[PDB]
From a paper:
Here, we present two crystallographic fragment screening campaigns using a 96 fragment sub-selection of the European Fragment Screening Library (EFSL) provided by EU-[name]. The performance of this subset was validated in two fragment screening campaigns using the model system endothiapepsin (EP) and the [name]–[name] complex of the [name]. EP is an aspartic protease with the catalytic dyad formed by Asp35 and Asp219 and has served as a model protein for finding inhibitors for other aspartic proteases like β-secretase, a key target for treating Alzheimer's disease. As a second and real-life target, we addressed the [name]–[name] Zika protease which is crucial for the viral life cycle of the [name] but with its shallow active site challenging to target.
The protein construct contains the soluble part of the membrane bound [name] and the protease domain of the [name]/helicase protein of the [name]. The [name]–[name] Zika protease is a heterodimer, the [name] wraps around the [name] domain and forms part of S2 and S3 pocket. For soaking of the [name]–[name] Zika protease crystals 40 μl of soaking solution containing 0.1 M sodium acetate pH 4.6, 0.2 M ammonium sulfate, 24% (w/v) PEG 2000 and 5% (v/v) DMSO was added to the reservoir. 0.4 μl of soaking buffer was added onto each dried fragment and incubated overnight with one crystal. For the second fragment screening campaign LigandFit and PanDDA were used to identify binding events. With this campaign 18 fragments were identified as crystallographic binders with a total of 22 binding events. Out of the 22 binding events 10 fragments are binding in the S1 subpocket of the active site close to the catalytic triad forming π–π stacking interaction with Tyr161. Eleven of the binding events are at crystal–contact interface sites.
Numbering used by the authors:
A (entry chain A): 50 to 87
B (entry chain B): 18 to 170
Write the structure that this text describes.
Amino acid sequence: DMYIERAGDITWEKDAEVTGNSPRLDVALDESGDFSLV
Amino acid sequence: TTDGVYRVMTRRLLGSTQVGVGVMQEGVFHTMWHVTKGAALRSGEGRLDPYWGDVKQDLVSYCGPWKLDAAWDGLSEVQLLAVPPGERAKNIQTLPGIFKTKDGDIGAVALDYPAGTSGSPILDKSGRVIGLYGNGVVIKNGSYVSAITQGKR
Ligand SMILES: CNC1Cc2ccccc2C1
């Protein structure tokens, strides 16, 4: 049995850390909602 | 019931465990299907019942229809409001990549958090939720990339 607990407002943070790259990937989505690489 | 980002917890395991995250907006709670499997949720002494869901999209809404309709613009950085298990909410800014599928293109964020972070919102510069984090793929080098998963309003 599951319950929810508030963790914050949904706001853009002006000086947030920036990271992560930007891959372009061919993917397939199956009937179960799982992504796979092509 | 206040708008905002929420942890999804269970006590049926050892201790209290965070199974995911979601978004309360306009009286509707939004998370990923794989987080709750469509089960009812408790909020205080109140109960939230599922209203809409779809395994293939991996989304579910509670108390009303899916309300989030902002979309990535295809050009600008976004922010993941990651809410990791046991950790304070924190914004991470990133330029999305792209999932290319036979049915069109989807934004994707190359950021790796524990599974319990699923349902964390991804935001545009106006603070609008453009999708939820946590349905994705592992790429050739072993790192994780999440679709920006958005429903229909
Ligand atoms: C190997 N992934 C790490 C990434 C992360 C971030 C916050 C808390 C825990 C963890 C696990």
